[PDB]
Design a binder for this molecule. Structure first.
Ligand SMILES: CNCCCN1c2ccccc2CCc2ccc(Cl)cc21
Length: 375
């Protein structure tokens, strides 16, 4: 079979170029109104295929800028807007998570929400098509729905561990005596909302004969049932740019990396293939604090730290042992530089972090985090 890199090459090979299209897609936008201007342009095109031409984007009448750079900025800005839970289309999957899911009540907020989701799908599609990234991390069932993969009990673990553990107990033990019914109780606005999982659900006892169905219905309720039209609209837009059959060569981890550049960073592998300069070593107090910091950063923050030091967010295949710098093989590097007063600096050409010898973990935490959020 093919690993991720070979799959991606294969994928691009099949993604043929449109010839029956204008040679560029022109889009003039104002920053104060990027979302509305982008929506009007991208949903107004005569043919979705027009969006496959070279992006020719202009902000606030600013002429004389590299159209390649402007596009990348646009994908960033439009992501921030589209995925902002304030608009009510997406929401965080849990109070303690940073991953996004489709808001079941998206329609209450926005009568025209299906066209907004189709638009979001078109833009996601445009990112994949033009080799750019969306800035946003979705829950794993989002990616699976895109790929028409079944949502499973396991998917519930990454999103809600308490719930996952309860359904798993149900799967492994006879639940009959608990006298559970085919209903779901959701806590909202200081009240309990009960929903029947099937007709007459309240009077149907969960047992070993029907618990596989119970679990299926609970999972569909949590991730699918209430957001079918929304996701259908997103997929419609997405598939106007990327043939659905082509996207199927990827699994859900590969797809997420493809679209959003996010994934789980093996800090162990990162750690073992780091080099040290000018006094630093694996056992050095400051270094011990560095790895302590990295270990307690979110996957998002780990990625962005990697981005800061290397210049890119991509984690090399076969791990950090094969990381490249600017002039050949160059391991991730931490060098002692500067006094504790200044922030850490990055030499991207050498994948090198210049790290002052801070005198406290919390100071290191503060200084390192400050440096990253500028990138
Ligand atoms: C009240 N409805 C809000 C609609 C959200 N929306 C916005 C946001 C700001 C300004 C205009 C609009 C309408 C167009 C639009 C288009 C796409 C998306 Cl994703 C959200 C929105």
């Amino acid at each position: 079979s093919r690993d991720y890199k070979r799959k991606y090459e294969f994928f691009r090979r099949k993604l043929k170029k449109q010839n029956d299209i204008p040679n560029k897609f022109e889009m003039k936008l104002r920053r104060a109104t990027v979302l509305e201007d982008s929506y009007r342009r991208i949903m107004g095109v005569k043919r979705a295929d027009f969006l496959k031409a070279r992006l020719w984007i202009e902000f606030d009448g600013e002429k004389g800028l590299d159209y390649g750079g402007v596009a990348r900025e646009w994908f960033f800005l439009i992501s921030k807007e589209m995925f902002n839970p304030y608009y009510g289309l997406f929401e965080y999957s849990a109070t303690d998570n940073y991953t996004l899911q489709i808001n079941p009540n998206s329609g209450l907020c926005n009568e025209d929400h299906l066209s907004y989701f189709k638009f979001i799908g078109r833009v996601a599609g445009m990112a994949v098509y033009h080799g750019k990234l969306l800035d946003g991390f979705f829950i794993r069932p989002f990616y699976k729905m895109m790929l028409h993969k079944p949502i499973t009990l396991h998917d519930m673990e990454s999103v809600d561990s308490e719930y996952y553990n309860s359904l798993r107990w149900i799967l492994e033990n006879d639940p009959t005596e608990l006298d559970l019914r085919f209903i779901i109780d959701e806590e909202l606005f200081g009240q309990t909302h009960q929903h029947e999982l099937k007709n007459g659900g309240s009077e149907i006892v969960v047992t070993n004969k029907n618990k596989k169905e119970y679990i299926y219905l609970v999972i569909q309720w949590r991730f699918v049932n209430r957001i079918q039209k929304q996701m259908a609209a997103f997929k419609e837009g997405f598939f106007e740019l990327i043939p659905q059959d082509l996207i199927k060569i990827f699994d859900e981890n590969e797809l997420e990396l493809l679209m959003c550049g996010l994934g789980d960073v093996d800090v162990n592998d990162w750690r073992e293939h780091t080099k040290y300069k000018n006094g630093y070593s694996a056992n050095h107090q400051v270094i011990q604090w560095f790895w302590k910091a990295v270990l307690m950063m979110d996957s998002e923050k780990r990625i962005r730290l990697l981005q800061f030091v290397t210049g890119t967010s991509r984690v090399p295949m076969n791990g950090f042992a094969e990381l490249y710098g600017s002039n050949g093989p160059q391991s991730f590097t931490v060098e002692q530089w500067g006094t504790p007063e200044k922030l850490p600096r990055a030499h991207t050409c050498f994948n090198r972090l210049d790290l002052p010898p801070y005198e406290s973990f919390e100071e290191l935490w503060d200084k390192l985090q400050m440096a990253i959020e500028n990138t």
